[PDB]
Amino acid sequence: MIQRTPKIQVYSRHPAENGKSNFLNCYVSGFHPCDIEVDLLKNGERIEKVEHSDLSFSKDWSFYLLYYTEFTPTEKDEYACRVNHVTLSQPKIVKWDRD
Amino acid sequence: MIQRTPKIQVYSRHPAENGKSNFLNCYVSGFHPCDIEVDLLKNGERIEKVEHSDLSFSKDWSFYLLYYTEFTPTEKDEYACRVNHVTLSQPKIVKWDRD
C-alpha cells in the first residue's frame, strides 16, 4: 500500500562483442504502485519495438517487470534504460555498462 | 492513458458437481490503470489462499489478470468475485452461476 521505488538493472545476455547479436535487458523490481514507464534507449533515442515480460507481484504487493530486445553492439553505440514512476522526482536513466 | 473499467468473468473449469474438485476463476480484463483489487468469496467471505496469474498488458495499455482456486462445490455454497478499481464507484461483486 506504501510507494516503493524500483530497483533498475541494465545488462546484456553476454558480454558486449561488436558485430555479434546479443540481448539487452532492463529489469525493474520491487516497486509499488504497478504504474510504470520503461524504455530502452539507443544513443538517447527510444527503441520502438521492444519486448516485455508480464508484470508479476508478490504477496507484499511489490512488482517486477522486464523489458528486453535483441541487438548487435557496435563500439560507439550507447544503450540505456529510462524509467518513470511516481516515486521518482525525475525520470531515471541507467546506462548499460558493457563490462 | 485513459481509465477503462474491467470486464469481470466468474466461471468454473467444469460444470458444478457437488463433491467433485473443480477450479473457480475470476478473469478481469481490458482495464486501466493496472491498480486493482480482486478477491474470491465463499459465502460472502474472502478466500485466503488464492492463486493469480501475472498482470499482462497489450500495446494499448489495457491489463489482464486471472485469480483462481481449487475448490469442491456443495449445493448450498455460494461463490463470487469482488473487484475494486478506480473506475468503479463501488466494489463490484459478480456471482458464480453454476450453470
Residue numbers in the entry:
A (entry chain A), B (entry chain A): 0 to 98
In the authors' words:
Following our previous approach, in the present study we engineered a β2m homodimer where the DD strand interface is specifically locked by a disulphide bond (linking the engineered C33 residues of two β2m molecules – DimC33). Therefore, the unprompted dimerization of S33C implies that in solution, under native conditions, the DD association interface spontaneously brings together two monomeric β2m molecules, and only once the DD interface is properly assembled, the two facing Cys33 establish the disulphide bond, which results in the formation of the covalent dimeric species (DimC33). In summary, our study presents an engineered β2m covalent dimer, DimC33, displaying the same biophysical properties of wt β2m in solution, such dimer mimics the first oligomer formed during β2m aggregation.
In order to assess fine details of the molecular structure of DimC33, two crystal structures of DimC33 were determined to 1.9 Å and 1.4 Å resolution, hereafter named DimC33_low and DimC33_high, respectively; additionally a crystal structure of DimC33 in complex with ThT was determined to 2.8 Å resolution, and named DimC33_ThT. The electron density is of excellent quality and all β2m molecules are completely traceable in all three structures. Overall, no major structural effects on the β2m fold are induced by the S33C mutation, either locally or globally, in all DimC33 structures. The monomeric components of DimC33 most closely match the conformation of wt β2m as observed in its physiologic class I major histocompatibility complex. The only noticeable difference occurs in the DE loop (residues 57–60) that displays a slightly modified conformation so that Trp60 participates in stacking interactions with Phe56, of the same chain, and with His51 and Tyr66 of the second chain within DimC33; the rotation of Tyr63 side chain of about 90 degrees is also observed. The covalent DD strand interface is structurally well conserved in all three DimC33 structures, where it maintains the same contact surface of 560 Å2.
